[PDB]
UniProtKB/Swiss-Prot annotation, chain A:
The gene is rpsK. It comes from the Bacteria. Located on the platform of the 30S subunit, it bridges several disparate RNA helices of the 16S rRNA. Forms part of the Shine-Dalgarno cleft in the 70S ribosome. It holds the Pfam family Ribosomal_S11. The keyword Cytoplasm does not apply. NCBIfam families: PRK05309.1, uS11_bact. Part of the 30S ribosomal subunit. Interacts with proteins S7 and S18. Binds to IF-3. Belongs to the universal ribosomal protein uS11 family. It comes from Mycoplasma pneumoniae (strain ATCC 29342 / M129 / Subtype 1). GO terms for molecular function: rRNA binding; structural constituent of ribosome. GO terms for cellular component: ribonucleoprotein complex; ribosome. This is Small ribosomal subunit protein uS11. Keywords: Ribonucleoprotein, Ribosomal protein, RNA-binding, rRNA-binding.
From Swiss-Prot, chain B:
This is Small ribosomal subunit protein bS21. GO terms for cellular component: ribonucleoprotein complex; ribosome. Transmembrane segments: none annotated. Keywords: Ribonucleoprotein, Ribosomal protein. It comes from Mycoplasma pneumoniae (strain ATCC 29342 / M129 / Subtype 1) (Mycoplasmoides pneumoniae). Belongs to the bacterial ribosomal protein bS21 family. One of its GO terms (biological process) is translation. GO terms for molecular function: structural constituent of ribosome. The keyword Transcription does not apply.
Curated annotation (Swiss-Prot), chain C:
PROSITE patterns: RIBOSOMAL_S7 (PS00052). One of the primary rRNA binding proteins, it binds directly to 16S rRNA where it nucleates assembly of the head domain of the 30S subunit. Is located at the subunit interface close to the decoding center, probably blocks exit of the E-site tRNA. The gene is rpsG. One of its GO terms (molecular function) is tRNA binding. One of its GO terms (biological process) is translation. It comes from Mycoplasma pneumoniae (strain ATCC 29342 / M129 / Subtype 1) (Mycoplasmoides pneumoniae). InterPro entries: Ribosomal_uS7, Ribosomal_uS7_bac/org-type, Ribosomal_uS7_CS, Ribosomal_uS7_dom, Ribosomal_uS7_dom_sf. Pfam families: Ribosomal_S7. Part of the 30S ribosomal subunit. Contacts proteins S9 and S11. This is Small ribosomal subunit protein uS7. Belongs to the universal ribosomal protein uS7 family. One of its GO terms (cellular component) is small ribosomal subunit.
Length: 114, 53, 154
RNA sequence: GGCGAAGGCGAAAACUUAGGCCAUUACUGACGCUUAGGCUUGAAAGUGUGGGGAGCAAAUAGGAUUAGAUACCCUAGUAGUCCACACCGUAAACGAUAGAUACUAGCUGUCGGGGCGAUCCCCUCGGUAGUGAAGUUAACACAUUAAGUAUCUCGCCUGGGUAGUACAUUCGCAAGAAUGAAACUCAAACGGAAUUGACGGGGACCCGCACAAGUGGUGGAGCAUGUUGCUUAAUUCGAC
């Protein structure tokens, strides 16, 4: 029911999540790897993120969307297959942005696994 | 990091924005000593000296 | 490690004029005896001619086309509980696997005589039953299920 | 890259404050180097009192792998890491190279002061690096910022295991710090450098029925034959 908006993709190094959102900030629909069939360690694959973005793009096509912002977030190899699927799904993408949670050198991160 | 005009010329430049974001963020997710911080910083600085010149 | 090796050339069968028939007559071969496997295959073709009246070449081509696999699963282990990677398979290997499956599922069934059992195998393959189409579809289902591994693989 | 004597110092401002470099037609006129004892500073961990606690995380609990795992992995998780006043005075507190001074090829950078002056580059005096001969070294290597040629002073060493242990002493509430042996034992040592092999669940490259692609085989039964074990008078001896 809304022409414009922002759809977010978070690419964790263990999972991926995509969430459509109204331009006001509130979300409209969202899917992820877990919502689909395969789960576990097999869900951190570029194919998983690609199909996750494909599903949300398809279900927002019936939701009546148009040119939409896109905020990639997180570190991981699945953040590009979602981009390609969004481009291939037939969307009206116009703007690309990056919204990583980049910190200034403040709080201490967890320890090195070794 | 907003930049996009029509289809792909901005995406080709997105790769560079992300790679460097990834490199800088990768050292804020594991903790190691300050001495090692400086040592790896100087080692990375040597690497630029070898290729970029 | 070695280098690529040459592949020999198969002569066409000089009665029915089809190389796939030669590949059948060589894959069903045992003991190295052409005069026996040839009788088996040509009696099977005669049986095809008699019941369900139809040119044997058409049934053969239909069965072979329905049996050829689209993808092939090749084992590539990294650690314990090894995972599989689907891989694309060339057309020559496609027909090789198809004819292998036809022959090997033919020589395991009821209807004791080899003639009738292989004739039923080829008839069922033409009619898309669970004889060998089921196995082809099972190994095809094993593909594109691990397709996440297939996309990023070597 | 800069500074500090060392530890260390990196968001912004204010106050206080330390030392350093260049030029000096100025001044005192040997007032200089080193330093036993002494004094001051001195990473982190730790301790006493009062606050603080977002994240992280010894100890601890649970889930995994393993034969075991009190470890590596994962989820929780206190002391602590933070601040105010003291105490502890140890580190690979490393340039494994004490301080002060005179002299000894050169080349390539870089930083500051000065003159010249659009930067760049000219050069002078300094600080910080690389390459490099005579010279030194057992070799690696150092080589004008010396491990070179020499002097002055201090500290320290005299085989290894015993052992930085024991006693005594001083300091500290504290864990400990400083100083620090001997009895016994070995002919060598968790000695140094370098050389050739061998090895690496270290890299790079290259072959083979090695893997991969198939065919047909053994381990399932009977039989032949050989071997091990047992037995008897020997079950001749060898091959493992």
């Amino acid at each position: 029911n809304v022409s414009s908006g922002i759809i977010h993709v978070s690419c964790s190094p263990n999972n991926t999540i995509v969430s459509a959102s109204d331009p006001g900030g509130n979300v409209l629909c969202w899917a992820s790897s877990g919502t689909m069939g395969f789960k576990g360690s097999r869900k951190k694959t570029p194919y998983s993120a690609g199909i996750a973005a494909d599903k949300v793009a398809k279900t927002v096509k019936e939701m009546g969307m148009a040119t939409v912002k896109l905020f990639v977030k997180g570190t991981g190899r699945g953040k590009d297959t979602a981009i390609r699927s969004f481009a291939n799904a037939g969307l009206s993408i116009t703007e690309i942005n990056e919204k990583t949670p980049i910190p200034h050198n403040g709080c201490k991160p967890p320890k090195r696994p070794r | 990091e907003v930049k996009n005009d029509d289809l792909e010329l901005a995406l080709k430049k997105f790769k560079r924005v992300s790679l460097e974001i990834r490199r800088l963020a990768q050292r804020h997710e594991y903790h190691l000593r300050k001495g090692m911080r400086l040592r790896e910083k100087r080692k990375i600085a040597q690497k630029k000296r070898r290729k970029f010149r | 490690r070695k280098n690529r090796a040459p592949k020999r050339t198969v002569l066409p069968d000089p009665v029915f004029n089809n190389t796939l028939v030669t590949r059948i007559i060589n894959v069903i071969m045992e003991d190295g005896k052409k005069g026996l496997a040839q009788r088996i295959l040509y009696g099977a073709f005669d049986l095809i001619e008699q019941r369900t009246k139809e040119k044997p070449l058409t049934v053969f081509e239909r069965a072979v086309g329905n049996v050829m696999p689209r993808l092939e699963l090749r084992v590539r282990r990294i650690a314990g509980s090894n995972y599989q990677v689907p891989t694309e398979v060339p057309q020559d290997r496609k027909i090789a696997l198809a004819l292998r499956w036809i022959a090997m599922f033919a020589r395991k069934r009821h209807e004791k005589t080899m003639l009738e059992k292989i004739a039923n195998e080829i008839i069922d393959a033409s009619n898309n039953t669970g004889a060998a189409i089921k196995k082809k579809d099972d190994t095809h289902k094993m593909a594109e299920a691990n397709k996440a591994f297939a996309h990023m693989r070597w």
